[PDB]
Design a protein around this nucleic acid. Sequence first.
DNA 1: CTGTTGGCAAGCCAGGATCTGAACAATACCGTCATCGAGC
DNA 2: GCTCGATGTTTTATTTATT
Lengths: 351, 352, 150, 151, 219
Amino acid sequence: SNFINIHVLISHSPSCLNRDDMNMQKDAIFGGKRRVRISSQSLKRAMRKSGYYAQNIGESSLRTIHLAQLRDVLRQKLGERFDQKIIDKTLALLSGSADAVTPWVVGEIAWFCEQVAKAEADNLDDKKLLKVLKEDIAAIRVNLQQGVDIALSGRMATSGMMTELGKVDGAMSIAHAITTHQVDSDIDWFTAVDDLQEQGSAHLGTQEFSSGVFYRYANINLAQLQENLGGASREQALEIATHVVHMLATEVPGAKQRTYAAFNPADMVMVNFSDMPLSMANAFEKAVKAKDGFLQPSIQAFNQYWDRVANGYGLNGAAAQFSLSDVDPITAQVKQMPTLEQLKSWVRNNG
Amino acid sequence: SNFINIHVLISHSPSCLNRDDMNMQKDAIFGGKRRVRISSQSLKRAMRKSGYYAQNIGESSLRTIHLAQLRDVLRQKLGERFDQKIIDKTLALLSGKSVDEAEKISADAVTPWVVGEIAWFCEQVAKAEADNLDDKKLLKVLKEDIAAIRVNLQQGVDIALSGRMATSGMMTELGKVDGAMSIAHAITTHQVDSDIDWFTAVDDLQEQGSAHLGTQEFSSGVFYRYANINLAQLQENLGGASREQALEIATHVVHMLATEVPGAKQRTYAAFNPADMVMVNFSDMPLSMANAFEKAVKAKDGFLQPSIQAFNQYWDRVANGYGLNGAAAQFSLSVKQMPTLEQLKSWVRNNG
Amino acid sequence: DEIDAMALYRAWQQLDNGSCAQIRRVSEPDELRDIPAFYRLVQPFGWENPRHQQALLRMVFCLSAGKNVIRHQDKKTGISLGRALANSGRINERRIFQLIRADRTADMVQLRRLLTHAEPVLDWPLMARMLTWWGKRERQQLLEDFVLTT
Amino acid sequence: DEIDAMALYRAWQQLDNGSCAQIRRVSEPDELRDIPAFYRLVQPFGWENPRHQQALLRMVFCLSAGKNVIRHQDKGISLGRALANSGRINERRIFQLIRADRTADMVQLRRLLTHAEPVLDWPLMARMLTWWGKRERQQLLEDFVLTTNKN
Amino acid sequence: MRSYLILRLAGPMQAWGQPTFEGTRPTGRFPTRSGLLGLLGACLGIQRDDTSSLQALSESVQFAVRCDELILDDRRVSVTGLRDYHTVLGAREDYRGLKSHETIQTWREYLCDASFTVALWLTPHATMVISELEKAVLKPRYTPYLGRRSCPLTHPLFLGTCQASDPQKALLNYEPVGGDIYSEESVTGHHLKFTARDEPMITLPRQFASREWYVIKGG
DNA sequence: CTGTTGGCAAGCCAGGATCTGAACAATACCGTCATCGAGC
DNA sequence: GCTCGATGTTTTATTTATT
């Protein structure tokens, strides 16, 4: 299959992990009922800026892209629109035996080739060209040393990219996190006591906060990941996928965490392969009612939903489920995992 | 490891340690059930104002919005070290507010101040105007080295642990501190239906009946305190302290989190209970155990035993599942077995 | 389908001294399940049907405040409970806050205490509807009526 | 993990006259732990499991009022509705049951059964005897008072 | 009768655009023509610079959208709207270089409890065949989503295939029936029209020309 | 080896009043337009 | 390559109910 589906159930203690311009908890109406929400961008940032990400994705081995090795395939690809003089001049001034090439690299380099061609036509060179294109070159260089970050998460907010081909979507897609149950949020009426004020406090306020059993969903386009890694292998893509699983299972937005401290890990992590990526959010369309907590009924509802619809929805294919609870499991079609690591290794070996 | 995780299970006899706008107990919905709550700000202020904190860590910062009263205080304290003018201008530079002789001068918001930090600052201001250096360039120069100012935060550790922001004045650029620690609201491990006390106030000049009839919410509870110290950040916020100093501070935080209880209604409910269970754990990234109590602890010869048991079970589930192997010591009383809190504290002092 | 609240009111009103005395000394709504006189009171008003059970527990508690504490007075909507509590002029606003913020069973105790203090004149079937539902909306409405009236 | 009530009812109704005669002879439920025929009866119903065994003590003690006393019907009629339907019991006696302490409650229940000879749904009553506690006493009184007052 | 390809666009949140050049990113009630062309274009492996096959898809396919009310436990659930306060840290200050703003703001609208059923057919001079479109929606190359990448699908894109006279009958074959149908092809007893500006000007990247749906109400 | 049956289970009457239900002080700030040319 | 500062423009709609 081409897609990796990652499903996570994770329970948070009383906190406020994502708010709006009125400092109110982000929410969403699902199944006619209010669910507390953690926005996709907040979750994905929580991943992308994390230390784990920086160590395993940021400092990856396929990180650096060498323009040297890319000379030939570039030479043909752009060879139809540009001639080898301009191509090699461009490549050499940028840098100062590869099979395929990442599309955004081809695009940006092609733009640079347009620029140097138009630079030769007008009759110009030297520090003139190298001052007009100083910032641009700096940009493309910094990006050329961040290939895995760009392949997985997409180009940064301020990238320097200049072509339609340089609009790099991430390989991973992260849905908004929503609670599996209805939530009426709590209010914290707080005071700020002045050490110089005898009567009363110096400030008064309220803070909205709530517990919640969240359902995170994310999927990974393997093909696109390989292709954006310069034609890497399925296995390397599966390593990256392993990392994504880990982060989606452990990483939590730092919003309001200094004071509410909801540092909780996932109680359930499932991964399955498919040709069509699907969210199991409809397992909670009818809001989960609490029976000795919201966690167990949530996992149970997830399992029952999968058992009901997985066959018809064409979700046949490799599927593993790491879990901390002892709730009745899924169909036997899903391979049970006792540690997260065994699940990640299950992912490494193509399922 | 960079993170010190402090877990506390503490039982309180009937009391009311934290209430809201309508004098009712603070609570929180967890796992579909109501838990009594002690807010984190209450815990932090209870700690920073404690005798233990005063004896072992130092002076708590001075949090205020009243800049005039502050002006007067600083004048009274930094008077024999600086001339009044310099003190005034320094306050006026840090706050962004004009400090004259007004009866009432108000800052942008309640802000924590460290007297020593202010002293250092007005040293800098003195040496600034003496060298004919205007205020903007002074801001640049001071912006070039923030560690010193953070050693001035060594004189106000609660700001190094809990943080500080300012929206106006040079503080905006220089006093921006991200808290080192991190702490959760204390919630009970079980469902609570709070009791109500129907009381009367008897008048000694009124033979017939009472002079006041009223109600007061209260309850018993087995609270779960959690607090991890970030450590590298504690070193940064203290101006570049050693890991030993940060570890010792963390130790004091363990002792306080284990023993300190807000004074709310304690002169009439007196729930002076120490923690029955305390556990400290070193880890690469923070880990809270609140999901041990997501399913509310059902009573069984008390709420405390099943709470501790549930805590241990979930701890093992998490450690086995995520393969966590950071050093850990538990002190129990009902991973380590700590006959005494002191052994656990020394164990923490010694990097685990 | 809907509980005849006035019939329950008159029923409670012409109840013998004994049965009444037995229902009155209850200290929380659920305890009314221990009193036979209660069942004999609410049986003709649909008690053997659960929804009615909860509603009737609330109603009969509020009535159990006493025979002469809730004065029904016909419509000229009709005097709502909040309005009545304010009209008494005996009840502090803070107590109304503490009432509408309270949780299950506690809310009914506090309400009965308020009723005992105010001795409100109100449209009883109206308050009966309120007690039937008693969601968060109803409690907020209680508070806001009380405020607007003062 | 529940005791098959109907199976126990059938087991009692089919039991030899001698053994059941030996069982009826007991004066209070604990004494049943001294009769062999008792164990011989409640053995295929998990007497080995303690909770089950207290439950079984009560159930058998009620079944030992007679053998034709409790006419098991089938939808269901509760114990309260049944004792009320007999018309032979006055409310004060029901109170004298639900207020009685340990063991004595069972005796009073036995006498009430002998007296009323109720037609009821046995498994329901069995469930009641299993969780014999404040809720079942309460619902007993509820059913009795309601059924009585309807007549 | 012609061959139709029936699709399903369900998920907790969706986003179907309206004209904008601002931080506000608005949503329509039902899927936009350009949004659908983009969904299909994502199922196929079409890059953003491949204007050729982009235009081929645009000139091969026409749509018909039906709005499906969510029924839950016999109770109807109406489509709600959602406003997302979406900030961006370190956002590009200009279209080149590396200078950036500390924080910038956006406001993005989503549809909640929304689900649609799309009927798809071929123009008289189309290039592709519904077979390969079926293969595409069964095994997409790029990740398909409902407007925005943060909007996953909870039901498989493929719902079915059938033959029929008009899109209304084709859609009649698939529950839940009764939703309002907005089609690019007229239908006899119906004359309403829904103007919109979602016909993607392709030769002019990211631009939009005017067009009109044929509105056909449900019973 | 063998363990029983009938007949019977109550009524009267009674549940209170007095009087009381608080006050004060305090609810923040920043940024998320742009222009130009100058000084640095 | 900037930070500086003065500057193009313009706002107001109320005021007692009852699922």
